[PDB]
A paper describes a structure:
In contrast, short RSH-type alarmone synthetases only contain a synthetase domain and lack the hydrolase domain as well as regulatory domains found within the CTD of long RSH proteins. In summary, RelP always appears as a highly active alarmone synthetase, while RelQ can switch between a passive state with low and an active (i.e. pppGpp-stimulated) state with high (p)ppGpp synthetase activity.
To gain further insights into the disparate enzymatic activities of RelQ and RelP, we attempted to solve the structure of SaRelP in presence of the non-hydrolysable ATP analogue AMPCPP (α,β-methyleneadenosine 5′-triphosphate) and GDP or GTP. However, we could only obtain crystals and solve the structure of SaRelP in presence of AMPCPP. Coordination of AMPCPP within all the four active sites of SaRelP is guided by π-stacking interactions of the adenine base with the arginine residues 78 and 112 of SaRelP. The ribose moiety of the adenosine is coordinated by hydrogen bonding via His190. Interactions with the phosphate moieties of AMPCPP are mainly established by lysine and arginine residues residing in β1 and α2 (i.e. Lys80, Lys88 and Arg91) and Ser84 contacting the 5′ α-phosphate. AMPCPP adopts a kinked conformation that is enforced by a magnesium ion coordinated by Asp107 and Glu174. As all ATP-coordinating and catalytic amino acid residues are strictly conserved among RelP/RelQ proteins, we suspect a common ATP-binding mode and mode of catalysis. Our analysis demonstrates that binding of ATP proceeds in identical fashion in RelP/RelQ proteins, because both proteins harbor an identical architecture of their ATP-coordination site.
Numbering used by the authors:
A (entry chain B), C (entry chain B): 33 to 193, 198 to 229
B (entry chain A), D (entry chain A): 32 to 194, 198 to 229
Write the structure that this text describes.
């Protein structure tokens, strides 16, 4: 019964990920056409696993139903935009939000206000129209925009998360020196363009 | 020259148009299968016109050799071909796509209802599509050739007769065309009844 | 326990499908390079679902273990080569078997000896070396080679299989007239090359 | 001429070589992750040399402008770049690939152990690969550039300094190179300990 509703959820949010991905790749493709630089290194897509969706609903004391999840959970559809340089992150943000049918919903900038452990990434939730066979759906998609250095750090830290406390200090040490080397590559890249 | 640059610009933006068309179409196919357990689309082929065939077509129509003329007058710069599993899937795809707010019909030629003299059959619609670029919006036409697998199989062989040698197989092609429609009608009739 | 063995099975037979697919596409790509014709229309790959694998093992009274399935089941890895013309089928067969590291295991030609219901397809099982991280595996892969007409017929018939008996007769009727129209396209295509 | 045809032949067969190399490499990456829950490869890039850059390289080395010479003397006609997640993954990929019966080492240059003067770092191996064509077998060389993500990030920026402007950033590049190796050493050291 309810499970059908969640299967429906997985399907339409997968479609949302397709329309965003096409938008993003066109922006990357056109920017390189004009300025001979690719802002995007690569992208990863993911529809939230159901058991993680149910876990998150319970952590927030919410009902286990697809319509509740559709309301309260904004990262059912997630895309991760790994960029080549630090300024490419905000370039992607500007290019996408300027589009008529893209609506900002949430913005959390962990680059300028990093988490305690050193995590850095730009998180924006945007709305996207998805034209289905017999219906239109405007669905939220969480976009994690980051540099390659931020991505490699987040990968190592993710795989850890009672073994976090040991490496917590020098992970933050790595985080810091990743930002410093990427700052230096950015300043060089800024100057050659 | 500046023009050749213009044609490179043309190839780039019409390639992007094909990306947005393809995502729309595959979502429709994916959602229809989700609801009704049937895939209207068998496969799709994309193509941006070669510059050298684009220049040929401009000259064949007595038009100027410029990107601004080509954008206006040539509607098959971006081409997508939607090969469908059954004949009724063709018009289903058309209906589903045109009802979308940002897709506008521009040209329609129904060679299924009114086949060509040689037996060619296909639905040809040109639609307009918004393409959001880095610093600009472009609304671009895309020619969609919607057809069955049988129609595709026939059109491939006929295309490979050309390139004074069409007259020989003209009759024997017209027979293949006819018997393709007849067998596909019957598979359509069976598929309708079991759904 | 045993389930681990079947997970291992799925992984290595998936890799087998990758090496075959690369072989087949190179052959198709080279044939078109030389003769300006593409024998292959498209291909579908599939590793057998486990519950269907366990079902098949029970139907044959065999043990439910990965090593037994690896021996007795030759269609764990399946690839389907849908060809443009009838003669392309045997062209693909010739091109692939001539390769040094491809070994024929089983051949059943349902084109010349169609099944009672009208099914037609060339079925060959071949062996393929798969170089893994720390080990080599020579694995069987079932190849179903057919025309587009044979494929469309098989699709309609598969989806139906107590409702087979009704359409059984005119399915065979369709089967026959598919072969006749494809014969005529073949004779024309033979003559233009 | 007949030659230009020869170079078209060259592009075709070396593209096929890249397909067999890629399938081997991805299977190794896929199997290693299956066993040890780690992906050595982050991503891969493929490339067949442009004919016009191939002609340039032949002239730079005083060689004849023919496909038969290029096949013999130029080993980076087919190029693949294996970007790895950690430094030790680089040599792991090399070991796994060369131990295969039908892969033969042809050339090896280890710029990781002996970096270039500007700070470039990467493992360069040319290997031979059998390519089974429709009517013929070809054993073709493929140049493999194996590197970390940091090495890739650095090499991209340095490549975009060229194309009398390298001297300015030469020192500041050499620093970036160094601190990339140092941060990647530490991430390697952490990753080793948690496995
Ligand atoms: N926007 C995003 N896009 C692509 N992948 C993402 C992503 N967010 C997380 N991932 C990755 O998807 C995998 C599974 O994530 P989940 O457990 O389902 C949600 P989460 O990462 O815990 O975010 P949450 O804390 O907001 O709920 C993780 O390994 C993560 O790295
Ligand atoms: N909408 C479309 N979708 C997919 N492929 C198409 C297509 N239109 C043409 N093609 C294919 O592109 C290849 C080269 O033909 P082109 O010159 O580019 C267009 P055309 O078919 O010649 O239209 P034209 O007769 O008005 O000039 C052909 O193989 C053709 O089948
Ligand atoms: N060699 C093959 N390659 C690709 N797909 C195949 C295939 N053989 C069968 N399929 C398709 O895979 C889907 C699931 O097949 P399965 O039920 O797992 C085995 P099967 O089709 O019953 O063959 P079997 O009777 O020899 O056991 C079917 O819909 C089928 O059309
Ligand atoms: N093994 C390889 N794998 C992936 N990309 C490669 C590659 N070798 C070169 N490339 C890329 O191909 C693009 C054009 O360079 P090419 O002229 O084709 C070869 P090259 O790097 O100039 O070698 P060369 O200096 O010996 O001539 C560059 O962006 C380069 O990074
Ligand atoms: Mg999240
Ligand atoms: Mg046209
Ligand atoms: Mg089978
Ligand atoms: Mg080189």
């Amino acid at each position: 019964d309810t499970l059908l509703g969640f299967v429906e959820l997985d399907h339409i949010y997968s479609s949302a990920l397709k329309e965003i991905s096409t938008k993003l790749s066109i922006l990357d493709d056109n920017f390189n056409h004009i300025y001979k630089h690719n802002p995007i290194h690569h992208m990863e897509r993911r529809v939230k696993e159901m058991r993680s969706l149910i876990e998150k609903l319970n952590r927030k004391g919410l009902q286990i139903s697809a319509e509740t999840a559709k309301e309260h959970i904004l990262d059912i559809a997630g895309i991760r935009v790994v960029c080549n340089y630090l300024d490419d992150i905000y370039l992607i943000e500007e290019m996408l939000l300027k589009q008529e049918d893209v609506q900002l919903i949430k913005r959390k900038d962990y680059i300028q206000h990093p988490k305690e452990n050193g995590y850095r990434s730009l998180h924006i939730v945007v709305s996207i129209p998805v034209f289905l066979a017999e219906r239109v759906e405007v669905l939220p998609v969480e976009i994690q925009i980051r540099t390659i250095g931020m991505d490699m750090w987040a990968s190592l830290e993710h795989k850890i998360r009672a073994e976090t406390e040991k490496y917590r200090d020098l992970l933050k040490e790595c985080a810091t020196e990743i930002t410093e080397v990427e700052d230096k590559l950015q300043q060089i890249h800024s100057e050659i363009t």
